[PDB]
Design an enzyme around this catalytic site. Sequence first.
Site: not given
Lengths: 336, 336, 336, 336
Positions: C151, C178
């Site tokens: 990602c 994150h």
Amino acid sequence: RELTVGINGFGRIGRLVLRACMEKGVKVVAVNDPFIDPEYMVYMFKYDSTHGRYKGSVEFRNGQLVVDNHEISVYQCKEPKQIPWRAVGSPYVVESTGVYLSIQAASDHISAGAQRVVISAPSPDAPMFVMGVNENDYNPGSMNIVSNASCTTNCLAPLAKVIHERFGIVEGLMTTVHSYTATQKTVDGPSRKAWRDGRGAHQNIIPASTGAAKAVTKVIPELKGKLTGMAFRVPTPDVSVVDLTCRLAQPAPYSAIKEAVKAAAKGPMAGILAYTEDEVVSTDFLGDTHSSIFDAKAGIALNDNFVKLISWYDNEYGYSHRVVDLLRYMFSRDAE
Amino acid sequence: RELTVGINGFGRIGRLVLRACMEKGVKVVAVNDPFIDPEYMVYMFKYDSTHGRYKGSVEFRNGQLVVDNHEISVYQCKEPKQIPWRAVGSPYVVESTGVYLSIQAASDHISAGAQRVVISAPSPDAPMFVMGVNENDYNPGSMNIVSNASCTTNCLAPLAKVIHERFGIVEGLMTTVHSYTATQKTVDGPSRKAWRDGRGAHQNIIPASTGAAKAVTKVIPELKGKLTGMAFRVPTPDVSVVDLTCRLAQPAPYSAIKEAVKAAAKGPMAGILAYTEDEVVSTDFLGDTHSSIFDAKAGIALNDNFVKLISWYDNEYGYSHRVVDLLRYMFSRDAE
Amino acid sequence: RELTVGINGFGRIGRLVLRACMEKGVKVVAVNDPFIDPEYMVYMFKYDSTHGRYKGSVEFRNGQLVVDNHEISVYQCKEPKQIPWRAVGSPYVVESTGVYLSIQAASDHISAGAQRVVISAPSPDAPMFVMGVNENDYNPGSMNIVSNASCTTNCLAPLAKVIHERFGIVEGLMTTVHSYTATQKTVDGPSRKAWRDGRGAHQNIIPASTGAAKAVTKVIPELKGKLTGMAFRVPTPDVSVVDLTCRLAQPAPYSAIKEAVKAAAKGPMAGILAYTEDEVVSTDFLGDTHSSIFDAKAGIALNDNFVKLISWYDNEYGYSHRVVDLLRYMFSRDAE
Amino acid sequence: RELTVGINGFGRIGRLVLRACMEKGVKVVAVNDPFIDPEYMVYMFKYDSTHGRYKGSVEFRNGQLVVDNHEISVYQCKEPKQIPWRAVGSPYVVESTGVYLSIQAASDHISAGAQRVVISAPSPDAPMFVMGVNENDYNPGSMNIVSNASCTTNCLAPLAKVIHERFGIVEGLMTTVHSYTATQKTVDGPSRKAWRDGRGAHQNIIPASTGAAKAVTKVIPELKGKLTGMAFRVPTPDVSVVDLTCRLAQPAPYSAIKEAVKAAAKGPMAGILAYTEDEVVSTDFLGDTHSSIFDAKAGIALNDNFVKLISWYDNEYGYSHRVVDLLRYMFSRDAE
């Protein structure tokens, strides 16, 4: 000839009531808020941490808020008396600031031009309605100002109505496990009227007083004296759950409780009270427009007369829709 | 001559039970865990997100865990049968893995060398104790294996005992609003035996089954049939609250309920059940060593016979201390 | 004559790749997962705490998962080599379990009848692709097993390309802030390979290693040795943000940086790299299908050659859509 | 003959400066806050969600706050000019309300009888001090009003000094990954001056401006023009972390970087700058009294001249202890 709406206050309930109006085809002609200018209203309406980006268009131009190419007038008045409601056609007004709760305070809207007022909060003296329970008690002649009660009362009353009418409620005590709200603090801060509500909202389970269960005994008079409750504020930003512990008169094996709720949800209380047997959790009701969603698998019974019933509500989204529902209903009765 | 303890499993309850032993002067001679080596045990014991850094010293050297210069043997056995408990003096063993709950399973500790076993979790068949309620029912001859019940049962039973003995409990239903735990998931993941417990723990209010309220009717036989309940898991990492909704036989105005709890907390249940009238929230009980803390201002009564009682517990810290308390108590009875 | 897809693993990326396939009209013909049966798959797929209820119909019947009336075979094989990919027409296979990452491990799917494999994760040796950056280097003739990177790599690579090509990157260091993931723990628990990662995800800011920045130098060769980075895991359940601190060769006043990204987003990277000047926060990107959304107002420059550029990504939803996009692209090239 | 301290404001920094004073044995003789009466002060001071119950005694009597039996006068003045600092012996005053930041505004305390003022926040014009970096530039002869900078400036400046002096900083960009604070909102609410900051603090990663990095160039002049930065507010209630990305002049292999910080922490900056090699996470620094704790294992280097250095700080507790340290230092110099 048509229903037009004005909104006072552009807090969470104000903004979400506008979404519900757009969803249901109700025309909003104006918003008033002294602190939030039009360009900022655009931003606050468009982006929402809890309910996602507005699914239409939102812009401003010519000092106007513009939603789905419907132009919406914006005023910046600090006091309800000052709002030129006549200048926008004497709409029904949603009073959502939380600080004009009495019939008297709210009535400044009427002096200023408003045909009716829905107060989106409980009121000490204004008449109180829960769609699905007592809206056919609205008297168009004498009621210029009504309250749509609370989010929590809207969850509990539909369910209480169903259980009482089927089995009779001897007595009940309610807990709501409730998402935190705008009245709370991010970190330990000042809340001199209610000390616990100052403590950091994300860190704590916070016990809190609520009049919601008692309010139910006002929209359902036959329950006077038989309901009260309290609240725990917990670290979720939306969706709440009613935990009703009640003693029932008629025997009420849980299967008959389920069949009664199911029948109400399929019929007279469709769109208000829903029923589920799924393994649901709070986020599964984000954006749900029901007032009350009965969780069949979550409830427990000690015996056929003493039971704990569980019902979910999107405390922001359910209630906002019910405000629009009330307005529409009132309008369909004021033309008499 | 002295009480020595062995701990099987170094999960949260294992580590916190070691802290409680260090606090209370109880000598731990060994820890067993197959997955966590000594150097990692040092790290996990030293640093704790919830309860802060260990307030003594923690080191390893010579393959040993060393806590406050007390050297602690470390084994890495996958099965209780394999643990050389004889090699460390046949200690009382805390069985804290959560996966050897039956008298039979646990008894492998005895085969391996353990004098007694405290299971730090409810057991289907092992005898069950709640300090402050029924520890004087421990039979040293026939009980080689006991359970210290659950965190939640330890919160509820002290309170139930007090209320029942004073007023009589006709029937009650319990909700615990409970912090999430290690059995839960950070984001929606697999929980095939209990689907809701898979859903992300930080995002959701999660209804859950618990046997805690019913377990109370085992340590308090006269309440058989009169108690059950359920749980909501909420996004806090520790501290939980019991919400007991009960119908009482004798009239029980709230002032008499407060005086009964106060008297128990000041006397026979000192160190187990505490009483407060402060405007408290969950984080105010982080590190509290009581089993149960009665929140006087949070409770509500509908009338003199139907009431909602609120009691807090540090579900990690209270229970860990009670395990050490049980061990000490048992040791003082096994020398007969 | 048309793309068909098998999915190994029904974890978060498996379920959300299945959503992306339905949205983009890509036929899925089977799902493998040894632990999750069809009825439980229906539940996990239908309800999502982060991305809401599936907007469509989900049922099971005849041992099949049925989504919007498309029937999907369900296998329960513990090993890739065992999955009967042949029996469902030898589809392209998404390897989403995260434990078959090498060409050797993933080739068991090929030996089981998969036409091609996309590993939804970085691979130590399989060729790595970021849509918008290097998909043009895929070659059906030599490549039956590929990786869609991470990602985070998919957020940084498109931005790095635009910036390198316009200005030249001399050197850069990345932080990603994150959301926590399924590899983390609800409370301090075991994580013997990365001790920080076992600490409670919702309580902590957790530093972590990541190879995502270095991976960008694999798909953009000219950046070999010019980029590395690290991560902080923070208490949000989805959406993450890249913070790139880079030295640029050509003068690069922020206004030019902005026009370069805007130009890339409107044209060659449309749908991959997006550009915004709004006052956004992380929840504004829930459900965003872009790989990377440049936040113009959040970045800051020290001077014309040393800047900090900020880009958002929904680490679940963007990446999943990219897996589907690579599958469709690969298929469009396998007709050669 | 001894330092005495008055505190204006009983917000988070006011309360925690009062804790730091009791810990370090500094006499506090009054607190001013127009909105919080003595009984409510006792409660806010005694219970803290982040830092636990005050370890000591807290009562009110005779219109005074009494902490560990030291009596503290309580005033309720809305304006500094009105506080009778003279009546309590003309103490040093901590200006902690965040709305009197200029020399002109804070000098109203002086005119009310304060001997000196420490503004617990950045000032546009008052001289700014970071303990361990530049306190030696304080001069009682010319300076009656000073600023202790920000929490973040106090984390970066000590690290920047060590690194500049050892290696020379050419240029640096900072991110702070920062716990939310009292200026933020529990749910999307109003913040007309900084729209992002009104978005729900516990739901979001929120980019924010900060002048903390530039402020470091005020207390370390030779770094003028070489540093700026920005912030992300994330869903934790306390403890934050600096992420400094810098280009260094002299070669600076990571091992030397480490020995330079370690050397500073053991000697000249002991108690200000600390050094660790453990696998720490943010909760490990709750209650830490250092300004800055360098995390050796979390940092990463691209090469000998381009590195990312990570330092932790308890943004509440470190900063509060620094306010007290500056007060004690100032007093030790006012005897000249």
